[PDB]
Amino acid sequence: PITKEEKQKVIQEFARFPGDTGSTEVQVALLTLRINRLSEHLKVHKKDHHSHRGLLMMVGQRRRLLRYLQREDPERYRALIEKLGIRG
Amino acid sequence: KRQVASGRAYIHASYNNTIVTITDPDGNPITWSSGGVIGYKGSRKGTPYAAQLAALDAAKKAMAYGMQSVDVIVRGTGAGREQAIRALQASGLQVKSIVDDTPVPHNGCRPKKKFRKAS
Amino acid sequence: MRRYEVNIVLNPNLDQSQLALEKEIIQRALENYGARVEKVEELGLRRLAYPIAKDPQGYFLWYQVEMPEDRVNDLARELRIRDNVRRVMVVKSQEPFLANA
Amino acid sequence: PSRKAKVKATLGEFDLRDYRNVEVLKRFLSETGKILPRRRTGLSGKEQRILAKTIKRARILGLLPFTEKLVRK
RNA sequence: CUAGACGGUGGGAGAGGGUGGUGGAAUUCCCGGAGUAGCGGUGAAAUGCGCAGAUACCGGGAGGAACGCCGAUGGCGAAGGCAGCCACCUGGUCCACCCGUGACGCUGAGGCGCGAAAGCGUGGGGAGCAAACCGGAUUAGAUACCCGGGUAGUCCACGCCCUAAACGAUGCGCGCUAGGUCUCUGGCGGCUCAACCGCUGGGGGCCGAAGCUAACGCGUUAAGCGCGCCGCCUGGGGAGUA
DSSP states (O other), rough: OOOHHHHHHHHHHHHHSOOSSSOOHHHHHHHHHHHHHHHTTTOOOOOOOHHHHHHHHHHHHHHHHHHHHHHHOOHHHHHHHHTOOOOO | OOOOEEEEEEEOSSOOEEEEEEOOHHHHHEEEEEETSSSSSSSSTTHHHHHHHHHHHHHHHHHTTTTEEEEEEESSSSSSSSSHHHHHHHHEEEEEEEEEEEOSSSSSSSSOOEEEEEE | OOOEEEEEEOOOOOOOHHHHHHHHHHHHHHHHHTTOOEEEEEEEEEEEEEEEEEEEEEEEEEEOOEOOHHHHHHEEEHHSSSEEEEEEEEEEEEOOOOOOE | OOOOOTTTTOOOEETTOOOOOOHGGGGGSSSSOOOOHHHHHHHOOHHHHHHHHHHHHHTTTTSSOOOOOOOOO
């Protein structure tokens, strides 16, 4: 699982400013975190399909927030990606 | 011809026949009776009357080995199982206790068609 | 780490020594897995509702620990290895849900 | 009718989560190892649901029975 | 920008999923013990089993499969579907605070994925059950129903198949339109506490306003009043065939 520590560490590491909890950057970060763990869990447990839907959704909600980033600030976007290391 | 006195009586009821087996304080049978042991051959074998006769036959014969007191153990349900538990109480033997120990699975083997259509 | 509750039921026929030896391996085992013994209780002997290993009684050990969940499963594999150990139940500690109060 | 007495009322303030209180737990069992219905346990859907896990945990440990024989009949 | 949506902090319930572990009941078989003449089975029977000793009973062992009570009128899941306990890994979801982002939305042809049983391929397993099959009986005949056996299969793994009273016979989202009653799960609140009660949120049922409907019935879990998008019908058979 992801400890509160593990969590806030990412939240503060992405926040746009002191106290930023829901910036697109943050959200995307937290989702990238959950995804990876799940993608991991799933490298083993290739049968746990039920959890896999959960992933399809995380990946979904993420690629959809990112889509929103370009549209708005095309810079923060390229910025977030490079950082998080999304795409591939 | 051993002279036991105190023992067990197993009543095995079923919808086809009743068979009583008397035993010593720890399980080994002394004598046994059934619907067949006595007259009855087919359907008659089940009927409570037979159960009765068989119960008695069981006790009487066991009276020989000097039986007196017995613990009754009922297994299964069927054509007159209670009659057997009665013929005993009266047979002469002092019945110390009646106990239902009819086996039941915690769901193990698929039963034959005849006993399925359930769940 | 997470706070747990280890239960252990072992043979009620151990002599002062034999017993203290099994407890040895336990305490030893616990550390080997990160078990930080927060406390303990020892109701000892108790008349089981049904026989366990033919024996109608049992000796009880209760330890409330704190350890790396990623090993709690091993901790018990280990605890079950003993021959005198005839029961091992590790449980996540939980706030006492009161009732009729 | 089932109006003899609610096991809950006929008792004190206990921790439904405690799987070792053979003393109290044993109270919610039929004349067999069976767990009594709410009709008789006087517990609520939620309470009664927590009892079950506790009564079951207690069964594994050997403190509580799984099933007992019936006397009389 | 915050009324939608998403996020944060904090509470919560659950047979949601995956891996490993772990128990007892019962069936079958095997071993030991103890005991005779039948057991079994049916509407009656017979086949069958039993004196190489069966049947019921006690103890020991091996193996496979499933997991009473609780259990519900209950819960979970998108559906198919899902019910010992333990740990690990993991999905969804509700509530409180209103703290952060600031329309980041809805639907969704094709695609991709999931999708009971039976069935297929390789290997394993096989306790019980059981297509085919082998017998017994019933019958005018019995290629059936009933009874005794029994292979595939059912169980596991890996791959394939992709179907169905898969039903609430009620495509997805959103908004709007009396109540009453029972129920599962959360809440904060009222009486000095509690017991008791409140209303309030999510879910499951019943009855019913307005309304709808051919009728039956539906009735905030719509089949009502509206909007968006998808799929589908046009008559029946031929045919889900060529």
